[PDB]
Ligand binder design. Sequence first.
Ligand SMILES: [Ca+2]
Ligand SMILES: [Ca+2]
Ligand SMILES: [Ca+2]
Ligand SMILES: [Ca+2]
Ligand SMILES: [Ca+2]
Ligand SMILES: [Ca+2]
Lengths: 175, 174, 174, 175, 175, 175
Amino acid sequence: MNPFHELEPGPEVPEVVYALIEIPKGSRNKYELDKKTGLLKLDRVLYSPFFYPVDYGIIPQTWYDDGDPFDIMVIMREPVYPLTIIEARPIGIMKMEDSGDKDWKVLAVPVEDPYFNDWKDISDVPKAFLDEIAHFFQRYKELQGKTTKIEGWGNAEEAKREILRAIEMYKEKFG
Amino acid sequence: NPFHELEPGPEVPEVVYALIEIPKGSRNKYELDKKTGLLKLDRVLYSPFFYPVDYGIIPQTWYDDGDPFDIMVIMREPVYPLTIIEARPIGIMKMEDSGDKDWKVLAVPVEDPYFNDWKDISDVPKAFLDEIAHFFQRYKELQGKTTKIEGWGNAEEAKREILRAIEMYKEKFG
Amino acid sequence: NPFHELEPGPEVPEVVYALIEIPKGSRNKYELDKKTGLLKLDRVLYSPFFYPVDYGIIPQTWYDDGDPFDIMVIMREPVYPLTIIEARPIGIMKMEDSGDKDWKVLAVPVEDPYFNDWKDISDVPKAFLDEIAHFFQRYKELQGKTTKIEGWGNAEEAKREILRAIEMYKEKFG
Amino acid sequence: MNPFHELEPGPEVPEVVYALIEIPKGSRNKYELDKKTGLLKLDRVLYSPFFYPVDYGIIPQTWYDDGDPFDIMVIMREPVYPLTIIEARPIGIMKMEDSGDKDWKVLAVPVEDPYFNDWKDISDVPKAFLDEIAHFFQRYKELQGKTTKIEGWGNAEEAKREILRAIEMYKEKFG
Amino acid sequence: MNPFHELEPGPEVPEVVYALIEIPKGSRNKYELDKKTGLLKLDRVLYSPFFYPVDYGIIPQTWYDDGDPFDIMVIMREPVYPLTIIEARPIGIMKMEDSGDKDWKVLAVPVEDPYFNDWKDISDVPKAFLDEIAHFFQRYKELQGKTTKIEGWGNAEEAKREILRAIEMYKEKFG
Amino acid sequence: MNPFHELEPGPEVPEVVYALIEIPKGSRNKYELDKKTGLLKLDRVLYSPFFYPVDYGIIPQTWYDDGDPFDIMVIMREPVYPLTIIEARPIGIMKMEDSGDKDWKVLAVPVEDPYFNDWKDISDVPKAFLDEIAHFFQRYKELQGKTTKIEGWGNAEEAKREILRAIEMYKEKFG
Ligand SMILES: [Ca+2]
Ligand SMILES: [Ca+2]
Ligand SMILES: [Ca+2]
Ligand SMILES: [Ca+2]
Ligand SMILES: [Ca+2]
Ligand SMILES: [Ca+2]
């Protein structure tokens, strides 16, 4: 069974969504979901000594403008294992373009860690942390000759808007 | 869902399967999603405690608290979530959590020769039993929940409860 | 011995040195050997709890409990024991341990821009303060010791106590 | 169901095969796929304080002379998680017998780590590294009283021929 | 200052000794104390994928027949850092010869971990654990062409005897 | 006191030098020796989620054009602890400028890991690995607004000449 197709986008969209984690914070290995089988697959080893600064994954049953499931980054104190489901509250969105593709990514916090109880919008995140995430996506494919453009951060309302768009796109492509 | 498809064990109740959800050393509490059988984050423990054992469930069991029967396996090196271990029950922790009978089997892996002579609760260092009981006594304290630890039962008692849980599953499901 | 040779800080009490003894995530409790200044195992915590912060002492301080003044530094990645960190005090945990005044400074590292806007106790998520207090409330429970947590003071109060501890050191030693 | 039966042997066999990893480098726990459910299973804890020196798994849809799927060892700088699929280039083969059975193992490098771009055959591997792998397999079951015999290393050409034979054996026995 | 010369052999010799740890359990790197300076030094990387099964170090102010400080192995649940002092209770001794040298090693438990409160003699240790330690020292230098002979285990009384011998030897060589 | 002043530059300079490690591979924390006490000090947390790709330290009793001890990078398979001494063979040198200062760094392999026995010059290192190290230094201070310039790599001969120059500079400035 392919988790991407079988799980709902979340229990209370768009206030609480499911994040299906593919890459735990601290990994230099970039994993993806195998399209056919739903197994974890190594996509590549990052060409530079950078690590994913957040737990990284996808929202099930979404589709985005770049022709992939919609990506979500979840701030976890202790990283989870790949293929773990996290109930996540979206708090913002990173706007960026990768080789002409709109490759925006939702930023979210776990609902069930009380540490983040007061994080509800992009302004609640330390600025240095946002910069470190943006710098990662700006440079992580530099040695592969790819250029990415970081366009800035959007707030929680914008993230939620985009999640609803992505859910609709999925329904139109597969349903 | 691995909970339904796997047998309770290759030689019940002397050897059961433990389906591990939480490796020793984790502060994240994981459970199985009941719809899909994927691992799911239940919560992050509110206190800086870590699971002192690999923690999971015995497949095709059901217990008084309306959940699969819990099992704790002592592993020298923790396994990954969703790993099956063949485990020998050596005892049982008796506890209530918010008025529900929430007993948990203590077990050792059959395939680690380190534990070959552990066969009953008396073979476990007492400081180690204390640390496990203390974990369950306090790990939900900041969530305002009360747990009562009632003590430890021996291997025979553990095995009786396993048989009871295997029967309860058959009733409720088929 | 690093405790005696290092100054209390480059800009007391706004910036102090923390000499780390125990990295976050350790179950082993380390201290400095007073004769040699080497790291020494004090004990293994009796319960499966881990230090929720990097834990150490402020050099050339002394406190009411007859020890160097304790400091807890919030580090995203833990450091190695015997590492010096430049730390900004943002608060103070008030607690008694077996009748001794055992207060501990809470601090953030100056050189991690993540914490640039943490300047007082109100900037810390309350769940995090709770988890620290809970650790010290229960970590010696199985050793039969009682600790009393009296609450948190703010940055100004922390800095006053640091000045007091720096003076106490000068009295007792030279 | 069971990734061993559902996945193809590789996207471009035998030049590029899939390695389905069961044991990450650094593990003292020896895991195997439960061939009923396809879940990871603990087979044993190694009796000696040795760790797997490579990420160890099987090639899907293969069968070998010893009556199990064909083993593959992938050199990863950062170990992956169990049940991860890696696209791998075979560069050689370890010839060994375990309890009288032909228990040969493919040695491979990941296609998507540029570090190994110039590793194409067995002669590209540091000799000390080949020795460490062989010594592990020579001794890891010694306290269990089993005997293994290390017969040496074959080159990439030989490894690829054996992969094709294993693919054929699977077809005859199941397909 | 050199810790080997400055620290006493222990607070209550031979019932409780100091172990100055050089190698934490799980390390493949073999560290030693630099003779001149007392700093940690890499001696070698073990040639095989084996890890030290115990925290490993020396007793300060001792000298043994093999012309080195007397070695001690401490069973720790969580490994310590190098150059950490542990108050340790000797419970046995491993008898072995390395290239003609008597290279016996004390086995000990930490006084301040209540897990080991009842471990007082060699018979309290699981047999499989003793075997795993012995197998490690039997084979860890095999690829270096060295042969070691394991002669067996002695009890707590014998360990204590040897500690007293080693303390006296030190006094005669340096004092 | 201060290992930087007490230790010799190496046992057989410039063929074999001592590397005194300050930062283990994998660290995002940047450590430096406190030049008053010789204790390890946190200099900064890197502003970006990058990790040191090598074990990083200094050669004792050296001084360089940028007014600090000469930097050395040691390739270790398993990282060591801070303040560990490694006997290292120089195989090359990274030429770079940091804020207008000549901040060149020796690249070296450990003498006592047989894995690197055949690494003797810069051409023996996989090109992707040299690129990853250079990219780290090109970008690791970008969010601090500092600029570094990577000028390329020199061979073992050049590295050894620079080591001798640094040893001489130390003598003139302190000795
Ligand atoms: Ca995308
Ligand atoms: Ca239960
Ligand atoms: Ca105190
Ligand atoms: Ca085989
Ligand atoms: Ca010896
Ligand atoms: Ca420099």
